[PDB]
Amino acid sequence: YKLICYYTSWSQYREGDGSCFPDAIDPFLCTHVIYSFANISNNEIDTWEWNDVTLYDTLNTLKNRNPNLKTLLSVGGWNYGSQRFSKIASKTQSRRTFIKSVPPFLRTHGFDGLDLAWLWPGWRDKRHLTTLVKEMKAEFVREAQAGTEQLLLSAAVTAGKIAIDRGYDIAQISRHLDFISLLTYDFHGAWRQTVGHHSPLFRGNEDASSRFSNADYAVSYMLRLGAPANKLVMGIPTFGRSYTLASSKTDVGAPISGPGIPGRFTKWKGILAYYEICDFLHGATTHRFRDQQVPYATKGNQWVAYDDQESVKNKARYLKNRQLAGAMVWALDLDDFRGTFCGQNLTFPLTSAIKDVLARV
Ligand SMILES: *[C@@H]1O[C@H](CO)[C@@H](O)[C@H](O)[C@H]1NC(C)=O
Ligand SMILES: CC(=O)Oc1ccccc1C(=O)O
């Protein structure tokens, strides 16, 4: 079973103990470590940060410790216009320039493949997303001829039913892709003027407002659309989402005034790291959606839907039974990487719990 772990390039700026570089990463933790993010310019893969070349090197040296670890580089992400990506993929010469540009860049910096983080294609874009993956793969196949082991090509897919339908032809891209990472942690939109869990496993017996907002639906649907199990990786959040309550009402359907306050380290409204969360838990009221098997916390006018070791193992169990390829972790820098915030002296608590589960019978 593959354990695919993402690392973010900006994690480095976070203040104090939030500062995370790639040298903090335990080399036998994951199987595939992906580095976000990579930019495009002059229609070809380029770096984002001012010192990615150093960081790439720091990552791809961890491979000296674990000769078997594989490392990919992801392209795009959100801080990067769909319109931009779309512009490149929709034309035959810009799509070819960019493609032609990857293998050498990737080989220069030690990466073993490319992850396509197109934070999402429109419906006019679906056709080119297929053409882009198809042609991209063909290039990795033609450079394999030159000695070095073939470059892995993976894609990052959203788990929202409308989104999949809009810009992804699953049956077609699953052939050309080495694995698909399904983003099962964005199941609770902004508009929702209430609390709710973003990465629930099951529906929720309370009042199905759209039988589709959970990992289980999303998984069935991909396997239904034709993505083989041996190619699916379920996405597991290592972070939580906070919201500021609009009343003292704290359970299902509770009203919401807007996102929760910024964390001390992550400094972003509406989101918290697991290390920031273990700290928040102190003097909080914890609960659990029996139905959806995921926890949430609450203190003051702050309510959080998050993922703990039990929930994360429970997901890691589910996907084994489903016989999927493995799990994907949205982010390493957001797990308790120093292992100094969550009680037990264990670094990467959350990602370790899974790893353990992937090796059980
Ligand atoms: C990446 O590409 C865009 C357009 O190619 C360029 O204008 C911009 O400076 C780059 N963005 C970053 C964050 O490097
Ligand atoms: C999604 C993720 O990686 O966490 C964040 C989300 C929004 C803004 C900042 C961060 C962060 O990395 O600190």
GROMACS .gro file of C-alpha atoms and ligand atoms in nm:
model
  388
    1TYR     CA    1   0.000   0.000   0.000
    2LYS     CA    2   0.130   0.343  -0.105
    3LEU     CA    3   0.134   0.621   0.156
    4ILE     CA    4   0.146   0.947  -0.039
    5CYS     CA    5   0.251   1.251   0.165
    6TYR     CA    6   0.244   1.615   0.047
    7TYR     CA    7   0.487   1.886   0.163
    8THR     CA    8   0.424   2.257   0.124
    9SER     CA    9   0.694   2.508   0.021
   10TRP     CA   10   0.564   2.795   0.232
   11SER     CA   11   0.555   2.588   0.548
   12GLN     CA   12   0.907   2.726   0.582
   13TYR     CA   13   0.794   3.082   0.666
   14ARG     CA   14   0.566   2.983   0.953
   15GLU     CA   15   0.687   3.139   1.279
   16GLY     CA   16   0.903   2.947   1.524
   17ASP     CA   17   0.812   2.581   1.567
   18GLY     CA   18   0.575   2.611   1.276
   19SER     CA   19   0.875   2.654   1.048
   20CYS     CA   20   0.903   2.328   0.856
   21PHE     CA   21   1.160   2.245   0.591
   22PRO     CA   22   1.197   1.907   0.424
   23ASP     CA   23   1.482   1.795   0.650
   24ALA     CA   24   1.233   1.738   0.933
   25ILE     CA   25   1.070   1.454   0.732
   26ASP     CA   26   1.131   1.096   0.859
   27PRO     CA   27   1.241   0.904   0.541
   28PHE     CA   28   1.064   0.578   0.622
   29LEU     CA   29   0.737   0.748   0.709
   30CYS     CA   30   0.598   0.771   0.357
   31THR     CA   31   0.646   0.593   0.024
   32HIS     CA   32   0.581   0.891  -0.205
   33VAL     CA   33   0.655   1.245  -0.089
   34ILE     CA   34   0.516   1.518  -0.312
   35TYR     CA   35   0.645   1.875  -0.311
   36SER     CA   36   0.412   2.170  -0.365
   37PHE     CA   37   0.423   2.381  -0.546
   38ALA     CA   38   0.581   2.431  -0.894
   39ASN     CA   39   0.493   2.726  -1.119
   40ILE     CA   40   0.470   2.752  -1.496
   41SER     CA   41   0.616   3.033  -1.707
   42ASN     CA   42   0.714   3.059  -2.072
   43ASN     CA   43   0.488   2.756  -2.089
   44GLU     CA   44   0.711   2.526  -1.888
   45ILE     CA   45   0.767   2.392  -1.539
   46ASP     CA   46   0.954   2.641  -1.318
   47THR     CA   47   1.009   2.698  -0.948
   48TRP     CA   48   0.777   2.898  -0.726
   49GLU     CA   49   0.977   3.011  -0.424
   50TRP     CA   50   1.307   3.197  -0.449
   51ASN     CA   51   1.499   2.898  -0.311
   52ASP     CA   52   1.309   2.588  -0.431
   53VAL     CA   53   1.628   2.459  -0.590
   54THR     CA   54   1.778   2.430  -0.241
   55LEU     CA   55   1.470   2.275  -0.089
   56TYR     CA   56   1.428   2.032  -0.377
   57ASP     CA   57   1.786   1.923  -0.305
   58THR     CA   58   1.716   1.887   0.068
   59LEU     CA   59   1.419   1.667  -0.009
   60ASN     CA   60   1.588   1.459  -0.274
   61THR     CA   61   1.875   1.390  -0.035
   62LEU     CA   62   1.641   1.221   0.208
   63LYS     CA   63   1.644   0.956  -0.063
   64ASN     CA   64   2.003   0.885   0.041
   65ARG     CA   65   1.869   0.761   0.373
   66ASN     CA   66   1.582   0.569   0.218
   67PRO     CA   67   1.717   0.459  -0.120
   68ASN     CA   68   1.363   0.332  -0.192
   69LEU     CA   69   1.168   0.655  -0.128
   70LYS     CA   70   1.012   0.813  -0.437
   71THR     CA   71   0.962   1.191  -0.476
   72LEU     CA   72   0.724   1.384  -0.706
   73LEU     CA   73   0.680   1.753  -0.784
   74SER     CA   74   0.330   1.897  -0.806
   75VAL     CA   75   0.222   2.164  -1.056
   76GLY     CA   76  -0.014   2.452  -0.992
   77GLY     CA   77  -0.231   2.424  -0.685
   78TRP     CA   78  -0.470   2.707  -0.601
   79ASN     CA   79  -0.244   3.019  -0.587
   80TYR     CA   80  -0.238   2.953  -0.956
   81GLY     CA   81  -0.513   3.040  -1.207
   82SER     CA   82  -0.730   2.767  -1.364
   83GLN     CA   83  -0.745   3.006  -1.657
   84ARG     CA   84  -0.367   2.986  -1.666
   85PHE     CA   85  -0.348   2.605  -1.669
   86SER     CA   86  -0.637   2.592  -1.914
   87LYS     CA   87  -0.455   2.833  -2.146
   88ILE     CA   88  -0.153   2.601  -2.160
   89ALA     CA   89  -0.343   2.273  -2.207
   90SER     CA   90  -0.591   2.397  -2.470
   91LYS     CA   91  -0.333   2.468  -2.740
   92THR     CA   92  -0.115   2.216  -2.921
   93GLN     CA   93   0.206   2.419  -2.915
   94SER     CA   94   0.191   2.543  -2.556
   95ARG     CA   95   0.089   2.200  -2.435
   96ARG     CA   96   0.390   2.051  -2.614
   97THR     CA   97   0.637   2.312  -2.490
   98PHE     CA   98   0.536   2.250  -2.132
   99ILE     CA   99   0.541   1.872  -2.172
  100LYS     CA  100   0.881   1.874  -2.343
  101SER     CA  101   1.000   2.086  -2.049
  102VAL     CA  102   0.923   1.852  -1.758
  103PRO     CA  103   1.154   1.546  -1.782
  104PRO     CA  104   1.476   1.742  -1.798
  105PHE     CA  105   1.375   1.978  -1.514
  106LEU     CA  106   1.247   1.685  -1.308
  107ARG     CA  107   1.568   1.482  -1.371
  108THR     CA  108   1.788   1.780  -1.285
  109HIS     CA  109   1.636   1.816  -0.940
  110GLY     CA  110   1.602   1.453  -0.838
  111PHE     CA  111   1.228   1.401  -0.875
  112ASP     CA  112   1.083   1.067  -0.983
  113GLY     CA  113   0.766   1.204  -1.134
  114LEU     CA  114   0.502   1.471  -1.179
  115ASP     CA  115   0.172   1.526  -0.993
  116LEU     CA  116  -0.084   1.735  -1.180
  117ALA     CA  117  -0.240   1.979  -0.933
  118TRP     CA  118  -0.483   2.155  -1.163
  119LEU     CA  119  -0.707   2.319  -0.912
  120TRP     CA  120  -0.979   2.256  -1.134
  121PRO     CA  121  -1.068   2.243  -1.496
  122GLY     CA  122  -1.384   2.384  -1.635
  123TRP     CA  123  -1.616   2.188  -1.862
  124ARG     CA  124  -1.449   2.326  -2.176
  125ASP     CA  125  -1.127   2.202  -2.012
  126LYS     CA  126  -1.217   1.836  -1.964
  127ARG     CA  127  -1.116   1.736  -2.316
  128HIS     CA  128  -0.767   1.886  -2.273
  129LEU     CA  129  -0.716   1.736  -1.930
  130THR     CA  130  -0.740   1.398  -2.102
  131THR     CA  131  -0.517   1.501  -2.391
  132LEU     CA  132  -0.269   1.658  -2.149
  133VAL     CA  133  -0.234   1.347  -1.932
  134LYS     CA  134  -0.226   1.119  -2.235
  135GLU     CA  135   0.044   1.320  -2.413
  136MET     CA  136   0.234   1.386  -2.087
  137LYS     CA  137   0.257   1.014  -2.018
  138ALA     CA  138   0.370   0.939  -2.373
  139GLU     CA  139   0.664   1.173  -2.306
  140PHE     CA  140   0.758   0.995  -1.984
  141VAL     CA  141   0.739   0.674  -2.187
  142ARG     CA  142   0.971   0.809  -2.457
  143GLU     CA  143   1.232   0.932  -2.207
  144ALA     CA  144   1.235   0.594  -2.036
  145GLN     CA  145   1.413   0.478  -2.351
  146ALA     CA  146   1.717   0.672  -2.229
  147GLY     CA  147   1.820   0.454  -1.936
  148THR     CA  148   1.666   0.609  -1.625
  149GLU     CA  149   1.359   0.443  -1.464
  150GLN     CA  150   1.028   0.576  -1.601
  151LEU     CA  151   0.892   0.900  -1.453
  152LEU     CA  152   0.575   0.848  -1.249
  153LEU     CA  153   0.281   1.064  -1.350
  154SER     CA  154   0.001   1.122  -1.101
  155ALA     CA  155  -0.299   1.353  -1.073
  156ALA     CA  156  -0.469   1.528  -0.781
  157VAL     CA  157  -0.845   1.490  -0.815
  158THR     CA  158  -1.116   1.666  -0.619
  159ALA     CA  159  -1.384   1.455  -0.451
  160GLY     CA  160  -1.686   1.672  -0.520
  161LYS     CA  161  -1.938   1.510  -0.752
  162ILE     CA  162  -2.015   1.826  -0.951
  163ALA     CA  163  -1.642   1.895  -0.997
  164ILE     CA  164  -1.553   1.547  -1.118
  165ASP     CA  165  -1.835   1.558  -1.373
  166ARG     CA  166  -1.735   1.909  -1.480
  167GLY     CA  167  -1.369   1.863  -1.570
  168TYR     CA  168  -1.248   1.502  -1.532
  169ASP     CA  169  -1.292   1.206  -1.769
  170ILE     CA  170  -1.190   0.942  -1.514
  171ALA     CA  171  -1.207   0.625  -1.725
  172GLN     CA  172  -0.970   0.781  -1.977
  173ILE     CA  173  -0.711   0.937  -1.747
  174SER     CA  174  -0.690   0.637  -1.514
  175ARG     CA  175  -0.510   0.444  -1.787
  176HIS     CA  176  -0.236   0.702  -1.836
  177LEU     CA  177  -0.200   0.785  -1.463
  178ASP     CA  178   0.011   0.582  -1.216
  179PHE     CA  179  -0.226   0.683  -0.936
  180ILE     CA  180  -0.503   0.929  -0.859
  181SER     CA  181  -0.518   1.117  -0.530
  182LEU     CA  182  -0.881   1.181  -0.440
  183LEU     CA  183  -0.921   1.499  -0.224
  184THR     CA  184  -1.167   1.375   0.040
  185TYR     CA  185  -1.157   1.672   0.282
  186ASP     CA  186  -1.344   1.958   0.121
  187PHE     CA  187  -1.695   1.831   0.172
  188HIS     CA  188  -1.823   2.134   0.365
  189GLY     CA  189  -1.851   2.453   0.157
  190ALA     CA  190  -1.835   2.821   0.257
  191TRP     CA  191  -2.196   2.905   0.180
  192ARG     CA  192  -2.303   2.653   0.444
  193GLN     CA  193  -2.420   2.893   0.712
  194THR     CA  194  -2.364   2.616   0.971
  195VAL     CA  195  -2.100   2.393   1.128
  196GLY     CA  196  -2.032   2.056   0.965
  197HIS     CA  197  -1.749   1.817   0.890
  198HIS     CA  198  -1.536   1.862   0.578
  199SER     CA  199  -1.380   1.516   0.573
  200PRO     CA  200  -1.656   1.285   0.690
  201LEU     CA  201  -1.635   0.916   0.596
  202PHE     CA  202  -2.006   0.844   0.578
  203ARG     CA  203  -2.320   1.053   0.516
  204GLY     CA  204  -2.475   1.135   0.852
  205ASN     CA  205  -2.811   1.008   0.976
  206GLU     CA  206  -2.906   1.360   1.088
  207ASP     CA  207  -3.048   1.521   0.759
  208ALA     CA  208  -2.896   1.428   0.435
  209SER     CA  209  -2.887   1.755   0.252
  210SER     CA  210  -2.712   1.607  -0.051
  211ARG     CA  211  -2.625   1.237  -0.038
  212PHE     CA  212  -2.278   1.284  -0.188
  213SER     CA  213  -2.070   1.484   0.061
  214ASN     CA  214  -1.837   1.217   0.201
  215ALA     CA  215  -1.535   1.003   0.115
  216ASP     CA  216  -1.740   0.685   0.075
  217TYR     CA  217  -1.961   0.836  -0.191
  218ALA     CA  218  -1.663   0.985  -0.372
  219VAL     CA  219  -1.478   0.652  -0.370
  220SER     CA  220  -1.766   0.447  -0.501
  221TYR     CA  221  -1.823   0.709  -0.769
  222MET     CA  222  -1.464   0.696  -0.896
  223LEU     CA  223  -1.470   0.315  -0.903
  224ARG     CA  224  -1.807   0.353  -1.070
  225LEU     CA  225  -1.665   0.590  -1.330
  226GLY     CA  226  -1.388   0.341  -1.397
  227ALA     CA  227  -1.083   0.427  -1.190
  228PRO     CA  228  -0.937   0.097  -1.080
  229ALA     CA  229  -0.886   0.041  -0.709
  230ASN     CA  230  -0.518  -0.040  -0.758
  231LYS     CA  231  -0.484   0.319  -0.875
  232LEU     CA  232  -0.682   0.513  -0.614
  233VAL     CA  233  -0.540   0.689  -0.314
  234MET     CA  234  -0.789   0.832  -0.063
  235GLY     CA  235  -0.701   1.174   0.074
  236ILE     CA  236  -0.668   1.223   0.447
  237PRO     CA  237  -0.664   1.570   0.611
  238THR     CA  238  -0.402   1.628   0.877
  239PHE     CA  239  -0.565   1.963   0.949
  240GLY     CA  240  -0.891   2.096   1.083
  241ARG     CA  241  -1.133   2.370   0.985
  242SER     CA  242  -1.254   2.619   1.245
  243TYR     CA  243  -1.568   2.836   1.239
  244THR     CA  244  -1.689   3.114   1.466
  245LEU     CA  245  -2.029   3.023   1.607
  246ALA     CA  246  -2.314   3.272   1.573
  247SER     CA  247  -2.482   3.149   1.892
  248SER     CA  248  -2.440   2.907   2.184
  249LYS     CA  249  -2.603   2.640   1.969
  250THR     CA  250  -2.321   2.391   1.909
  251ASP     CA  251  -2.454   2.072   1.747
  252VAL     CA  252  -2.583   1.967   1.404
  253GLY     CA  253  -2.700   2.259   1.193
  254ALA     CA  254  -2.568   2.514   1.442
  255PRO     CA  255  -2.550   2.869   1.295
  256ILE     CA  256  -2.217   3.022   1.186
  257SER     CA  257  -2.090   3.387   1.175
  258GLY     CA  258  -1.792   3.312   0.956
  259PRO     CA  259  -1.465   3.117   0.982
  260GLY     CA  260  -1.279   3.062   1.307
  261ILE     CA  261  -0.984   3.279   1.415
  262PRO     CA  262  -0.630   3.234   1.268
  263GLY     CA  263  -0.393   2.994   1.442
  264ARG     CA  264  -0.075   3.119   1.609
  265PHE     CA  265   0.147   2.936   1.362
  266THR     CA  266  -0.056   2.873   1.046
  267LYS     CA  267  -0.197   3.230   1.069
  268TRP     CA  268  -0.488   3.163   0.836
  269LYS     CA  269  -0.856   3.225   0.900
  270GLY     CA  270  -1.070   2.914   0.881
  271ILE     CA  271  -0.793   2.658   0.919
  272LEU     CA  272  -0.578   2.494   1.188
  273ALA     CA  273  -0.282   2.255   1.199
  274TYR     CA  274  -0.308   1.935   1.402
  275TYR     CA  275  -0.040   2.064   1.638
  276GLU     CA  276  -0.239   2.387   1.682
  277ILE     CA  277  -0.546   2.169   1.734
  278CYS     CA  278  -0.405   1.942   2.005
  279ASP     CA  279  -0.339   2.264   2.191
  280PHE     CA  280  -0.691   2.393   2.133
  281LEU     CA  281  -0.838   2.069   2.264
  282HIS     CA  282  -0.727   2.168   2.615
  283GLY     CA  283  -1.044   2.290   2.785
  284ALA     CA  284  -1.268   2.206   2.490
  285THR     CA  285  -1.582   1.994   2.460
  286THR     CA  286  -1.518   1.702   2.226
  287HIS     CA  287  -1.784   1.506   2.037
  288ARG     CA  288  -1.804   1.259   1.753
  289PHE     CA  289  -2.034   1.211   1.460
  290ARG     CA  290  -2.119   0.847   1.531
  291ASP     CA  291  -2.267   0.838   1.181
  292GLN     CA  292  -1.976   0.994   0.990
  293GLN     CA  293  -1.699   0.867   1.221
  294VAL     CA  294  -1.502   1.193   1.261
  295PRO     CA  295  -1.461   1.425   1.559
  296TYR     CA  296  -1.522   1.790   1.628
  297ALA     CA  297  -1.439   2.020   1.916
  298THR     CA  298  -1.577   2.333   2.071
  299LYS     CA  299  -1.475   2.610   2.310
  300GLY     CA  300  -1.595   2.970   2.343
  301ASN     CA  301  -1.728   3.075   2.003
  302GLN     CA  302  -1.496   2.834   1.824
  303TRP     CA  303  -1.613   2.499   1.685
  304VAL     CA  304  -1.380   2.264   1.493
  305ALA     CA  305  -1.423   1.966   1.260
  306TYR     CA  306  -1.091   1.781   1.262
  307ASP     CA  307  -0.919   1.442   1.227
  308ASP     CA  308  -0.769   1.239   1.509
  309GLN     CA  309  -0.571   0.913   1.523
  310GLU     CA  310  -0.882   0.702   1.565
  311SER     CA  311  -1.066   0.861   1.270
  312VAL     CA  312  -0.757   0.853   1.055
  313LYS     CA  313  -0.699   0.483   1.131
  314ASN     CA  314  -1.064   0.420   1.064
  315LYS     CA  315  -1.019   0.572   0.718
  316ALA     CA  316  -0.699   0.378   0.671
  317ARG     CA  317  -0.900   0.066   0.755
  318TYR     CA  318  -1.186   0.147   0.516
  319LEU     CA  319  -0.961   0.190   0.214
  320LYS     CA  320  -0.780  -0.138   0.283
  321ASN     CA  321  -1.116  -0.317   0.276
  322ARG     CA  322  -1.207  -0.131  -0.039
  323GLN     CA  323  -0.870  -0.250  -0.168
  324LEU     CA  324  -0.753   0.091  -0.278
  325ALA     CA  325  -0.390   0.162  -0.371
  326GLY     CA  326  -0.314   0.358  -0.056
  327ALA     CA  327  -0.373   0.687   0.124
  328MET     CA  328  -0.285   1.052   0.051
  329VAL     CA  329  -0.210   1.294   0.330
  330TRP     CA  330  -0.287   1.659   0.302
  331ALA     CA  331   0.018   1.765   0.472
  332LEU     CA  332   0.311   1.684   0.650
  333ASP     CA  333   0.386   2.027   0.778
  334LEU     CA  334   0.041   2.025   0.944
  335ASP     CA  335   0.079   1.701   1.134
  336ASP     CA  336   0.259   1.737   1.468
  337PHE     CA  337   0.593   1.704   1.292
  338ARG     CA  338   0.806   1.796   1.595
  339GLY     CA  339   0.585   1.563   1.798
  340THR     CA  340   0.595   1.810   2.085
  341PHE     CA  341   0.234   1.936   2.088
  342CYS     CA  342   0.002   1.636   2.120
  343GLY     CA  343   0.089   1.470   2.450
  344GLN     CA  344   0.272   1.160   2.335
  345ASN     CA  345   0.636   1.215   2.234
  346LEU     CA  346   0.568   1.093   1.881
  347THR     CA  347   0.653   1.293   1.571
  348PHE     CA  348   0.396   1.283   1.287
  349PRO     CA  349   0.139   1.120   1.511
  350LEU     CA  350  -0.140   1.123   1.248
  351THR     CA  351   0.062   0.995   0.950
  352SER     CA  352   0.214   0.723   1.169
  353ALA     CA  353  -0.125   0.589   1.279
  354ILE     CA  354  -0.213   0.522   0.915
  355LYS     CA  355   0.125   0.374   0.825
  356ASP     CA  356   0.066   0.128   1.108
  357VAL     CA  357  -0.278   0.046   0.975
  358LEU     CA  358  -0.152  -0.005   0.620
  359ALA     CA  359   0.081  -0.277   0.753
  360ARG     CA  360  -0.172  -0.476   0.958
  361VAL     CA  361  -0.376  -0.775   0.841
  362LIG     C1  362   0.476   3.216  -1.216
  362LIG     O1  363   0.426   3.241  -1.348
  362LIG     C2  364   0.358   3.364  -1.369
  362LIG     C3  365   0.318   3.364  -1.514
  362LIG     O2  366   0.398   3.272  -1.588
  362LIG     C4  367   0.452   3.477  -1.336
  362LIG     O3  368   0.397   3.601  -1.381
  362LIG     C5  369   0.474   3.478  -1.185
  362LIG     O4  370   0.578   3.569  -1.155
  362LIG     C6  371   0.512   3.340  -1.130
  362LIG     N1  372   0.454   3.324  -0.997
  362LIG     C7  373   0.530   3.285  -0.894
  362LIG     C8  374   0.466   3.280  -0.755
  362LIG     O5  375   0.649   3.255  -0.906
  363LIG     C1  376  -0.403   2.384   0.279
  363LIG     C2  377  -0.273   2.400   0.358
  363LIG     O1  378  -0.172   2.337   0.323
  363LIG     O2  379  -0.270   2.490   0.479
  363LIG     C3  380  -0.283   2.630   0.463
  363LIG     C4  381  -0.404   2.682   0.408
  363LIG     C5  382  -0.424   2.819   0.389
  363LIG     C6  383  -0.322   2.911   0.422
  363LIG     C7  384  -0.199   2.868   0.478
  363LIG     C8  385  -0.175   2.730   0.498
  363LIG     C9  386  -0.043   2.693   0.556
  363LIG     O3  387   0.027   2.609   0.495
  363LIG     O4  388  -0.001   2.746   0.663
   0.00000   0.00000   0.00000
